[PDB]
């Protein structure tokens, strides 16, 4: 086996380890981070030895050996944001990506606004958004507007 353990620490001191390979690209390692600590790759830059790492590069390319600590900086935003208007009149702003389920949307409306997802209904283009489908599925891309209605 060519496997090897690795540590990647946040700027706050919350440190995390992953089992990776020299083969792995940097975008792959970012994908691995998202898997444990849900942190989209468009919201993370990785630094090693005072160098930003290119997404499509290996650990071998930047000569990272077994159990080398790496530094993780968080971004303020990612690629894609969508808006949600309520009935009482307010728009909130969500940090999203196309492959988020509708479940994952309501989850971070609960984080922003405190309304349980159990009671949230989302509408786009007059259609009631089913939980297990993505933003891609309804053709929801950047800057689009959803409408929030509570029921049950």
């Amino acid at each position: 086996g060519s496997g090897m353990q690795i540590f990647v620490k946040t700027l706050t001191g919350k440190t995390i380890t992953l089992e990776v390979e020299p083969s792995d690209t940097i975008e792959n390692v970012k994908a691995k981070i998202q898997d444990k600590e849900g942190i989209p790759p468009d919201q993370q830059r990785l630094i090693f030895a005072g160098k930003q790492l290119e997404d499509g590069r290996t650990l071998s390319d930047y000569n990272i050996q077994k159990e080398s600590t790496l530094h993780l900086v968080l971004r303020l935003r990612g690629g894609m944001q969508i808006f949600v208007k309520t009935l009482t009149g307010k728009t909130i702003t969500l940090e999203v990506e196309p492959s988020d389920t509708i479940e994952n949307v309501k989850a971070k409306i609960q984080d922003k606004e405190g309304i349980p997802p159990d009671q949230q209904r989302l509408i786009f283009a007059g259609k009631q958004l089913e939980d297990g489908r993505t933003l891609s599925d309804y053709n929801i891309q950047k800057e689009s507007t959803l409408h929030l209605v509570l029921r049950l």
């Binding site: 935003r77 944001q81 808006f83 208007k85 702003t93």
Partner: protein
């Protein structure tokens, strides 16, 4: 170090200020959207209205 302590809280100070200036433009887009939705409604009534008055121009010409 003393230089570093002064150096580092200056950088933390920039981080915070830039985070706030991020929200500046962020909530600015939120108002821009509601301004755009208010106008998307306003386009559509005219979009139908032009046909309304076009359908009563050809018929009215006969």
């Amino acid at each position: 170090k003393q230089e570093l302590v002064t150096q580092n809280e200056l950088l933390k100070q920039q981080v915070k200020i830039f985070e706030e200036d991020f929200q500046r433009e962020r909530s600015d887009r939120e108002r821009m959207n509601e301004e755009k939705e208010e106008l998307k409604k306003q386009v559509e009534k005219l979009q139908a209205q032009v046909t309304l008055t076009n359908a009563q121009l050809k018929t009215l010409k006969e």
